[PDB]
Ligand binder design. Structure first.
Ligand SMILES: CCCCCCCCCCCCCCCC(=O)O
Ligand SMILES: CCCCCCCCCCCCCCCC(=O)O
Ligand SMILES: [Fe+2]
Ligand SMILES: [Fe+2]
Ligand SMILES: [Fe+2]
Ligand SMILES: [Fe+2]
Ligand SMILES: [Mn+2]
Ligand SMILES: [Mn+2]
Lengths: 267, 280
């Protein structure tokens, strides 16, 4: 350490990531331990076994360990105190996301099911390969390019495209049916958390584009490199369920993906 | 069915995570600092500096540990200790709020542009600028029992368990007694509660490692004593600063017993050693 900002100066109170950190503290007090899951257990019990099986592929998607931590290292190493302050709320959010799904699986009795079997090739290419490789790269390579790639795979694709669509899917299937109210309450808290996360992704990608516009084009190319595995995983889930409007859900994915591109401007 | 569950609900560090969530909802943005600002204004310029060395110690220290906890969370996730990692997210968020609280107090009392670094002497720099980050960053390449005990000893048992605990006692002994800085002390009391969980994580980490090989207990003691000369060396310098700017003690009829505080620092240090046993 050469020195410390809160000794020489203050926190940059006007920094957008400090203002995002404040929002996270106000809006992130929810606790998975407070959610009533007893109705969810009775709803899963009340399902024929045909209906129990059809829910597992989508739930299997969410069963995927502080994925953002290397970004917190890289940005701390650069002296971005406000970002680090925000990223402590990002990490705690993700601990609560693992907690909520774990508790819900326990309540409905599938926490010991090996849900891995519903991860096809395209899923694994995103969650087993591109996400951890892009984030871990940042411990050795913190370049403008490496940071945009990390934020694209994780914040714009994994959170901003796939998770968003999964949450919308959960409301479209179960909220309408009046099923699984504890799960849906959890989903709504996760969806609010993930909004701040996507905003950190957008801000990170953009303060870089405000440097050099060549990177805006890296952003699009990286977004486009991953698209075949987003839609390839979506199609596999579509196929399994048909064996609930699957064509408006595939359209929501496409909608979300192009909407992520539009939140980064060239100027 | 057929696989192990994701989370061990009974693990001691999951229990600690659940308490951090329940007990850790305070927000520095809620603290009323308007009486502090009025208290600081009314001080003579001699009285406006007797508190600043300690604030300097805490602002930097809280900043340092916010940056420097990240390797421990890396190492423990790599060892598959999911429940520890869940707990360490509350630990990390706690420390960001501690840095926030101190910066807000500096900002509110009008000293936001003042460079408080000058109150970091040589021994302060050797712990917070130097030994803390080195021990923690080591865990990126070397996550052995030995490296983990050293990190948890410098961070939890010395920095939190000795220096910070003693700093909080100092604050209550001088400013709570005088009725100064009511917002700062409200923060102090919040920080003190959080830090109980942080020391407990250090105790549990250090102990689970000693329970495997007893040779590590002795490493622990040696690391504790290696750090002591810079602990007491920083404490002696702050003592020297207070004895020389006695105007705020005079004004508020405070008998500041610098030897009582020095004994508290010695107590805390011997007490952190005692909370680790050779056997178990
Ligand atoms: C069954 C209908 C299929 C159509 C909708 C497909 C979208 C589902 C996406 C589920 C994957 C979400 C993965 C969680 C990401 C994370 O770890 O934050
Ligand atoms: C005159 C007696 C001096 C007593 C010692 C005072 C110590 C000052 C505080 C500096 C340490 C702060 C470390 C922060 C710990 C954390 O944020 O986890
Ligand atoms: Fe997220
Ligand atoms: Fe395919
Ligand atoms: Fe602490
Ligand atoms: Fe000395
Ligand atoms: Mn999440
Ligand atoms: Mn602290």
């Amino acid at each position: 350490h050469d020195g410390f900002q809160t000794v020489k100066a203050t926190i940059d109170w006007e920094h957008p990531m400090f203002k995002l950190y404040e929002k996270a503290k106000r809006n992130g007090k929810w606790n998975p331990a407070d959610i009533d899951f007893s109705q969810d257990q009775k709803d899963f019990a009340s399902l024929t076994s045909e209906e129990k099986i059809s829910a597992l592929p989508l739930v299997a998607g969410f069963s995927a360990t502080l994925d953002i931590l290397p970004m917190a290292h890289a940005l701390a190493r650069q002296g971005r105190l406000e970002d680090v302050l925000f990223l402590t709320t990002f990490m705690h959010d993700e601990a609560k996301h693992v907690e909520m799904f774990s508790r819900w699986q326990q309540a409905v009795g599938i926490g010991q099911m090996d849900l891995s079997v519903f991860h096809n090739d395209h899923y694994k290419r995103i969650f087993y390969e591109a996400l951890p490789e892009a984030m871990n790269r940042l411990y050795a390579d913190d370049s403008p390019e490496a940071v945009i790639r990390a934020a694209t795979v994780y914040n714009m694709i994994v959170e901003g495209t796939l998770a968003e669509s999964g949450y919308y899917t959960f409301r479209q299937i179960y909220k309408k049916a009046g099923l699984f109210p504890g799960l849906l309450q959890g989903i709504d808290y996760l969806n609010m958390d993930e909004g701040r996360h996507i905003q950190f992704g957008i801000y990170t990608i953009q303060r870089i584009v405000n440097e050099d516009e060549r990177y805006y084009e890296l952003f699009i190319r990286y977004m486009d490199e991953l698209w075949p595995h987003v839609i390839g995983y979506v199609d596999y889930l579509t196929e399994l369920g048909k064996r609930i409007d699957y064509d408006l859900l595939r359209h929501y994915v496409i909608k979300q993906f192009n909407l992520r591109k539009k939140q980064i401007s060239r100027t």
